[PDB]
Amino acid sequence: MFMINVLTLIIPILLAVAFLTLVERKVLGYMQFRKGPNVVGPYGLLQPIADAIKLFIKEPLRPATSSISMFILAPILALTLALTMWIPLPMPYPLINMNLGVLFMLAMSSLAVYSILWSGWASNSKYALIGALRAVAQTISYEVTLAIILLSVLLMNGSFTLSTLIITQEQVWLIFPAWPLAMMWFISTLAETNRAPFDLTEGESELVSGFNVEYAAGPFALFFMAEYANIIMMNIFTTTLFLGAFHNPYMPELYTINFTIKSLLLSITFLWIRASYPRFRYDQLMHLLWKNFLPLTLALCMWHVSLPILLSSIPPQT
Amino acid sequence: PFFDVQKKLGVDLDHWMTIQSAEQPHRIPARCHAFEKEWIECAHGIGSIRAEKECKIEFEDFRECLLRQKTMKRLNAIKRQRDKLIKEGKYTPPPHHSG
Amino acid sequence: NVWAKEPVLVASFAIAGLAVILPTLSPYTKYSLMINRATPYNYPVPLRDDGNMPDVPSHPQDPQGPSLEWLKRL
Amino acid sequence: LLQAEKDRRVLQMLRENLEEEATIMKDVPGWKVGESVFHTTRWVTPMMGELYGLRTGEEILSSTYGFIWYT
Amino acid sequence: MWFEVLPGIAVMGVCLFIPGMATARIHRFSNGGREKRVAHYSYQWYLMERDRRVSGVNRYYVSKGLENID
Amino acid sequence: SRGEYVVAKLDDLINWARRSSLWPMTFGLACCAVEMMHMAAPRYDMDRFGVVFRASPRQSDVMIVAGTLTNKMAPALRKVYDQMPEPRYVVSMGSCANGGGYYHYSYSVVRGCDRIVPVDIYVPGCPPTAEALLYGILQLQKKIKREKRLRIWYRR
Amino acid sequence: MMTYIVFILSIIFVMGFVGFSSKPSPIYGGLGLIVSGGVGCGIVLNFGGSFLGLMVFLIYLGGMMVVFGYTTAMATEQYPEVWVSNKVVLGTFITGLLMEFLMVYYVLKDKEVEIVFKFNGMGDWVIYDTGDSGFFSEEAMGIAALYSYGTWLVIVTGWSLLIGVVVIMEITRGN
Amino acid sequence: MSLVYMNIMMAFTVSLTGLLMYRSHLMSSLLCLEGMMLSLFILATLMILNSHFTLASMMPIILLVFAACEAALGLSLLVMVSNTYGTDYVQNLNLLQC
Amino acid sequence: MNLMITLLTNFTLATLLVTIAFWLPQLNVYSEKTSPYECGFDPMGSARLPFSMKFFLVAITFLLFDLEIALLLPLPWASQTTNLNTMLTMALLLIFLLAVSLAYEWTQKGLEWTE
Amino acid sequence: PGIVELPSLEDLKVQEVKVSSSVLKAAAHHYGAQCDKPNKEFMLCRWEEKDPRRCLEEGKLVNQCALEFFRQIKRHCAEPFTEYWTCIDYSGLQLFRRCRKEQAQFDKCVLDKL
Numbered sequence A: 001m002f003m004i005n006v007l008t009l010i011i012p013i014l015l016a017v018a019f020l021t022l023v024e025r026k027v028l029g030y031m032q033f034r035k036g037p038n039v040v041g042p043y044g045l046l047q048p049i050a051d052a053i054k055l056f057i058k059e060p061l062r063p064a065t066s067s068i069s070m071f072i073l074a075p076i077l078a079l080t081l082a083l084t085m086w087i088p089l090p091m092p093y094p095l096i097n098m099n100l101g102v103l104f105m106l107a108m109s110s111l112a113v114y115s116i117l118w119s120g121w122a123s124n125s126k127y128a129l130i131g132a133l134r135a136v137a138q139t140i141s142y143e144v145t146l147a148i149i150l151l152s153v154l155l156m157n158g159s160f161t162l163s164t165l166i167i168t169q170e171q172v173w174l175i176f177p178a179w180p181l182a183m184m185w186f187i188s189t190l191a192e193t194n195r196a197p198f199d200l201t202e203g204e205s206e207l208v209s210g211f212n213v214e215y216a217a218g219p220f221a222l223f224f225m226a227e228y229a230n231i232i233m234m235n236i237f238t239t240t241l242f243l244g245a246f247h248n249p250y251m252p253e254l255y256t257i258n259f260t261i262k263s264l265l266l267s268i269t270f271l272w273i274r275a276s277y278p279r280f281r282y283d284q285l286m287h288l289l290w291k292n293f294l295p296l297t298l299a300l301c302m303w304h305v306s307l308p309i310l311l312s313s314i315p316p317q318t
Numbered sequence B: 001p002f003f004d005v006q007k008k009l010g011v012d013l014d015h016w017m018t019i020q021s022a023e024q025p026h027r028i029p030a031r032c033h034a035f036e037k038e039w040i041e042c043a044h045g046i047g048s049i050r051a052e053k054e055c056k057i058e059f060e061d062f063r064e065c066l067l068r069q070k071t072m073k074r075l076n077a078i079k080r081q082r083d084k085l086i087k088e089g090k091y092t093p094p095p096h097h098s099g
Numbered sequence C: 001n002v003w004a005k006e007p008v009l010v011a012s013f014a015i016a017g018l019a020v021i022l023p024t025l026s027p028y029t030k031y032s033l034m035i036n037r038a039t040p041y042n043y044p045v046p047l048r049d050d051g052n053m054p055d056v057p058s059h060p061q062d063p064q065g066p067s068l069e070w071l072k073r074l
Numbered sequence D: 001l002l003q004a005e006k007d008r009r010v011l012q013m014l015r016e017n018l019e020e021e022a023t024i025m026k027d028v029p030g031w032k033v034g035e036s037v038f039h040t041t042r043w044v045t046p047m048m049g050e051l052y053g054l055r056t057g058e059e060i061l062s063s064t065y066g067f068i069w070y071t
Numbered sequence E: 001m002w003f004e005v006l007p008g009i010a011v012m013g014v015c016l017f018i019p020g021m022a023t024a025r026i027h028r029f030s031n032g033g034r035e036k037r038v039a040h041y042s043y044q045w046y047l048m049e050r051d052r053r054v055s056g057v058n059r060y061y062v063s064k065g066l067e068n069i070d
Numbered sequence F: 001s002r003g004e005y006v007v008a009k010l011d012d013l014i015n016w017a018r019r020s021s022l023w024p025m026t027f028g029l030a031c032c033a034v035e036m037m038h039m040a041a042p043r044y045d046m047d048r049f050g051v052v053f054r055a056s057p058r059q060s061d062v063m064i065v066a067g068t069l070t071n072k073m074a075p076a077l078r079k080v081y082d083q084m085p086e087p088r089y090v091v092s093m094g095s096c097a098n099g100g101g102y103y104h105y106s107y108s109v110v111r112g113c114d115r116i117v118p119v120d121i122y123v124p125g126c127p128p129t130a131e132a133l134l135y136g137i138l139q140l141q142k143k144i145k146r147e148k149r150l151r152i153w154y155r156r
Numbered sequence G: 001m002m003t004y005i006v007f008i009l010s011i012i013f014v015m016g017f018v019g020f021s022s023k024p025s026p027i028y029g030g031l032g033l034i035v036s037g038g039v040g041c042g043i044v045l046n047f048g049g050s051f052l053g054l055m056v057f058l059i060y061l062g063g064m065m066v067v068f069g070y071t072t073a074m075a076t077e078q079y080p081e082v083w084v085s086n087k088v089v090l091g092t093f094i095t096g097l098l099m100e101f102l103m104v105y106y107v108l109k110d111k112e113v114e115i116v117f118k119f120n121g122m123g124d125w126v127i128y129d130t131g132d133s134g135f136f137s138e139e140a141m142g143i144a145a146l147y148s149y150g151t152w153l154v155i156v157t158g159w160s161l162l163i164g165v166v167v168i169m170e171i172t173r174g175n
Numbered sequence H: 001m002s003l004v005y006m007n008i009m010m011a012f013t014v015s016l017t018g019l020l021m022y023r024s025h026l027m028s029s030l031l032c033l034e035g036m037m038l039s040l041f042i043l044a045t046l047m048i049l050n051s052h053f054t055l056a057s058m059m060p061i062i063l064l065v066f067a068a069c070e071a072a073l074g075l076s077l078l079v080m081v082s083n084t085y086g087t088d089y090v091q092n093l094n095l096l097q098c
Numbered sequence I: 001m002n003l004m005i006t007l008l009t010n011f012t013l014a015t016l017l018v019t020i021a022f023w024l025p026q027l028n029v030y031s032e033k034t035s036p037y038e039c040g041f042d043p044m045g046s047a048r049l050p051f052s053m054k055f056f057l058v059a060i061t062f063l064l065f066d067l068e069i070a071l072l073l074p075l076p077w078a079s080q081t082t083n084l085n086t087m088l089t090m091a092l093l094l095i096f097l098l099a100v101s102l103a104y105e106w107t108q109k110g111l112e113w114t115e
Numbered sequence J: 001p002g003i004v005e006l007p008s009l010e011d012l013k014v015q016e017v018k019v020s021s022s023v024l025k026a027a028a029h030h031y032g033a034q035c036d037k038p039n040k041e042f043m044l045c046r047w048e049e050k051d052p053r054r055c056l057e058e059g060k061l062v063n064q065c066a067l068e069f070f071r072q073i074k075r076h077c078a079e080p081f082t083e084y085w086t087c088i089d090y091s092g093l094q095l096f097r098r099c100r101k102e103q104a105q106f107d108k109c110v111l112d113k114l
Ligand code: SF4
Pocket: F030, F031, F032, F033, F066, F067, F068, F093, F094, F095, F096, F097, F101, F102, F125, F126, F127, F128
């Protein structure tokens, strides 16, 4: 039955990604004053099903300078790790109650970065090379500030376990003891998610989608589903991490309702941020990241060191 | 040279890092606490040569606390003899989990 | 003036400097000390019968010993 | 009380395993039957094989590896 | 307005309503109506281990209360 | 007749699936490209039909040759066209592309783009309207309704 | 059924890490290296260490990221080498894997392996914790001593890291 | 004896010989130095974990932060090497002769 | 090894996606699709061509501040000790030294070139 | 080298206090209250001698004290103590804060009647 629980985690991620592509296209259409998919049956749904089926038709092809092992083993690591992030997520009681999950979040997100990098390398067509190096750039920028802001926000109340984290999210939301740290965290995760050209330089119009400019049409489903799992993934991690829900004891469905509605409203907020801002810039990303975030983050870190040592508000980190 | 301005200035800024039986962050034992206590109390006011001569037994007792090499030698001998006689078929023992 | 050339830096130095200065003056520091000493993971060991020590009581209900009381007393 | 239950359990495992050894190894030469490995006589802490030897996989995996990656 | 997008949001929300709901329903099904006993530390692990010891089945979730007082 | 019946159902499935999305790429030489951009205008949406821009040549289904195909362009056109998966389709959009058109009697101008690639659908008009181009895409979807590929494969 | 799973993870670790050490192109070297780092994290996590392995996997990963950036930057061939591309790399990979499987044979089906020490060949459920009452997951406090007792040690650590920063800056500046 | 000790020493010796003999790249050399670091790390950590040597468990974290900053120093020097040449093989090292 | 069970199931999911990509749907007629695309022109040599980089300090800077992240991460478990003021002193010294390093290479224009 | 003398299953036949873990952990306050004076003799023996197979007479003593304690708590109020420990058993781990009203019921029961 444990296998049944694993299957009931890896089945709704498929449906989540496909119907979220529907959501992206139609919300973005009504965002940009036009109309979304409407002719295809009831409003869209069977056409995103047809998108998945159509992309499985496409019969992909290997390039010349395209070492087969690295080539077809890159997006496998992408999709598998974009899944296996979802193990310690505390949808009301998580799949595996690990004693720490957030450094695991860090490591598996970095694995998603490496899989993007290896696909952009072994595509071996110079545009995926430029895009892979831009991905290296936005990973140099955004795997430090995210880590130290994480250290700050669980410095206050965390003790590394998500069940104690939902206990700490009880009287007030943790948006209010750390609000500008939350602003910087949301911008950093929006960068790391590699959607939202507010902080995305991989899916360019200057290049053509620097991860997989010329990959193949077959594993585009793998890559596409992996990054939208990344979107839902970090937004659910947001909706656990900062704000939350007063769960009923011995009834989790109300927690699921409040948690899911807050998470998908923040996901619509994320897509609504993607809709309206221009693309951004390599050295400006370095400039903005370091010379705007990093001293203010360190100041928040030392101030959340000094706060529970001066208010006796230290956690019961057993 | 070997300098102990460490010892002279009255600050043990390094020597807490050193051995078990120093006080842990919570007062918890190591695995071989008592054996180090044995070996130091054999070899405290000793000049490291008759320590080699005469505290040799309790030092070997400490080394076999740390590694348990002879105990694993004994247990591996017992398991391999058990496996050869169960491959044999002479008096297959059931006394674990049963009579 | 000196403010908005790169003003997030001034904001960082300000909140960092008050983070340095602020543990000098507080009424809660020794509270933090006594809480963070008075909560053990480990076991309160017994000891030998006594030489009639006028401390260290015989029943845990006996109020001769140093207990924790200021928690429920704010 | 948990200390007492654990002590009765480890004495039970040690008694049963000494008896099983004295039955199964009585024919081989050498092999004193119940010698401590160490030179002195103190209560040596058992090594999770003197407790858990020849228990055929599932019991030893339950005892050792349960807390690590299970639950 | 947004009147023509809400079926997509509702269907995709049920696609995120399902996994925690089925998760907790399976965990309540998986121990005879009791919650899955977590185990953080070694102490609670040994407590759960004597629990699975003193049920006889070597399944801890029965937990045999007040019956073997005598 | 259960074999041909099930194969007929599955062929109808995949042909519906092929005519569902159909995202093109943007080749777009001259003012026919401006008409493509006005086919991306909100008064005539293509994303009612799942029809999305996609600038890579590696995942589009149809390809719109729209503009005045010259000799300096045409080998690059076919070297885009070939590295594209096996269902591939061509929309000849505009009088320049569908037979040469207004620059027909000149050097350095390919007289009709059948001299480089095959063409499924011609849509004349200089430029086409957004409405006429949309009509051409609907007729191409009806061609994808007229496939009977898997019936041919079974009855072979 | 299986019991040697820590030793088997060590075997996979040594296989990938020797194919790492046989020096192909650093792309494939990093692939085998991150495979080895992940399974070594699995080794130390399954052995009893809670966070330290996942931590060092993260750190070591970021190091390999920068190493990949510079091997894209500098060392490129007209066609880079793979394991099965050249004679010498293939020979070294086969011989290292041969020594690995030979050690597997002498551990499994034999008694004793005595190359540098008389290593006791049997399963690593011994030696191990005999169910001691932790209640605080020992290595957590074992790292938490670093800010309690660790006065001098982090002083010299941070001082040497500050010197590392200015050293990299001046060697790059010294043009 | 815990057989993982011998196996990590085997991986140590092979990564050491890989660091010593090497064909042309300085990059592979720095990379395998980083690997041998990781091997010594994991070995020392398993030692401390069997010992319950909980007091000075500063060894893993501090050992590896120092050895990784050594690797940072090496990457800086490799930057200078590839700056003063195109190729960074065993060739274009033969000046400053013994 | 429950995580290993789940990793095995996701790898089987990934392999069935590989096989349903390649083998099942249709055929694979070759002979030009294997060519590398840039924009319509066959480029010189190939890629894996020596490509210089802009940042020189920023990658090593990432490396050293990731190591200092690694030092800073046991701040939650440190926060419960009897020697509170010493913990606060050394922690403030760690972050103050870190910010001194950052602001040093920031005022010595280490980041004002090809970032 | 040296030999050991492990005592057999003769003296180690004391009836195990076979409550499970939840009710046992729930009743820990009052079990500290009524009993748990004479068991510190056993605990002092164990800490000052560090060799079990020596103190186990007081192991029988602590086991009989606990079993007589649960005898006296079964033979009287509370019968809603059944409801109290089955309240504490469901709440994941042993959160002493989620189950409060029945704690007040059981403690006021035992405070009145005993
Ligand atoms: S056919 Fe007409 S509208 Fe199209 S490219 Fe030619 S001149 Fe322009």
